Amino acid sequence: WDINDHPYLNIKGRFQRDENGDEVWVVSAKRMWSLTQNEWLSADEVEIFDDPLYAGEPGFSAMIHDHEFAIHKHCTDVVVSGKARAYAKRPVEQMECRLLLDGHIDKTLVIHGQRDWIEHGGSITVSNPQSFIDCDIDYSHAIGGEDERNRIGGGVASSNKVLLTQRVPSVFYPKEDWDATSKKVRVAGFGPIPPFFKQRYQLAGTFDDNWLENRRPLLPVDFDRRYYQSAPLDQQCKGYLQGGERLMLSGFSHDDIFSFRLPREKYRASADFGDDQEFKDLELYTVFVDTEKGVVSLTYSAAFACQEKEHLLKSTSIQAVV
């Protein structure tokens, strides 16, 4: 059952550099389940992503998905790409979207209809929401703007003039809405956290003059491997998912809730660096729910440190654990 060329997993490996500049062989294995077709897609139809994908300019637009070769994650990320879709296609002015993963995640966000700014003697507020059937809910609709928490959002500006060129944010946690005091309103969404969000790039450490002169080429001393997690913090699981957990999403389909139960198969990888055979358990690093396509992607990963014997890598095989 030791399969280099696996019959249902798509498997890909990339070398990465760790925070000391040392090479790491990262093996990622991926499965996709069609919620519509109720079947696993064949490995040929499964793509493991070498690079992040952005909606617009990289670094200035919502991140659709991150790359899949993190050297380490301490828990499973769960991320959603989809739209708010009102029940039965009845127009509404606001609705709730909920991500439920038993034991790990229970998250509701409130989605508002589109709104306009209302100016009044140098004071600005928001109009009533417009009715909608479906809408986008990515971080360009979250609080942000002139704000390192989310520089692609709206509602945070240094002047009324700038504020009026921004989109009124529409995605919030329950009991929160836009207020002029921006830091009291959380950035909200279900999608992956772009590295240019302060909550993430802060974890990469301080690239200051001290670093430039005395630490480089190493990463900064305050680099934190949590930087590799791409889910929102309340969508990071309690450790790694083990199989059998139930996932439920409501508000992303007009007609029904999405429901998915994780497979129980677990995997072990083996990498051959010459005469040295190495074994590491894969863990589930990412659960990516695309409700527009009706697919759930599952990416498993393991990382083999190989600064000693880079060129000596012969083979990598993955076998299911019985």
Residue numbers in the entry: 4 to 325
Give the exact sentences the study uses for this entry.
Type VI secretion systems (T6SSs) are dynamic protein nanomachines found in Gram-negative bacteria that deliver toxic effector proteins into target cells in a contact-dependent manner. Prior to secretion, many T6SS effector proteins require chaperones and/or accessory proteins for proper loading onto the structural components of the T6SS apparatus. Next, we present both genetic and biochemical evidence that PIPY domains require a cognate DUF2169 protein to form a functional T6SS spike complex with VgrG. Based on these findings, we propose a model whereby DUF2169 proteins function as molecular chaperones that maintain VgrG–PIPY spike complexes in a secretion-competent state prior to their export by the T6SS apparatus.
To circumvent this obstacle, we next screened a panel of DUF2169 proteins encoded by other Vibrio spp. that are closely related to V. parahaemolyticus and found that the DUF2169 protein from Vibrio xiamenensis, which shares 64% pairwise sequence identity with DUF2169 from V. parahaemolyticus, readily crystallized and we were able to solve its X-ray crystal structure to a resolution of 1.85 Å. The resulting electron density was of excellent quality, and we were able to model the majority of the 337 amino acid protein except for its three N-terminal and 12 C-terminal residues. The overall structure of V. xiamenensis DUF2169 reveals that its secondary structure is almost entirely comprised of β-strands arranged in three antiparallel β-sheets that form the core of the protein. These three β-sheets fold into two β-sandwiches that arise from the two shorter β-sheets stacking against the same face of the third, more elongated β-sheet. A search for structurally similar proteins in the Protein Data Bank using the DALI webserver indicates that the structure of DUF2169 is unique and therefore is considered a novel protein fold. Our structure also reveals that in its crystalline form, DUF2169 adopts a domain-swapped homodimeric arrangement with the swapped region (residues 195–232) consisting of a protruding loop that contains a short α-helix contributed by each protomer. The interface between the protomers is predominantly hydrophobic with several aromatic residues forming π-stacking interactions. In particular, Phe210 and Trp214 from one protomer π-stack with the equivalent residues from the other protomer. Collectively, these biophysical data support the conclusion that the domain-swapped dimer observed in our crystal structure is an artifact of crystal packing and that the protruding loop that facilitates this artifactual dimerization is highly dynamic and extends away from the core of the protein when it exists in its monomeric state in solution.
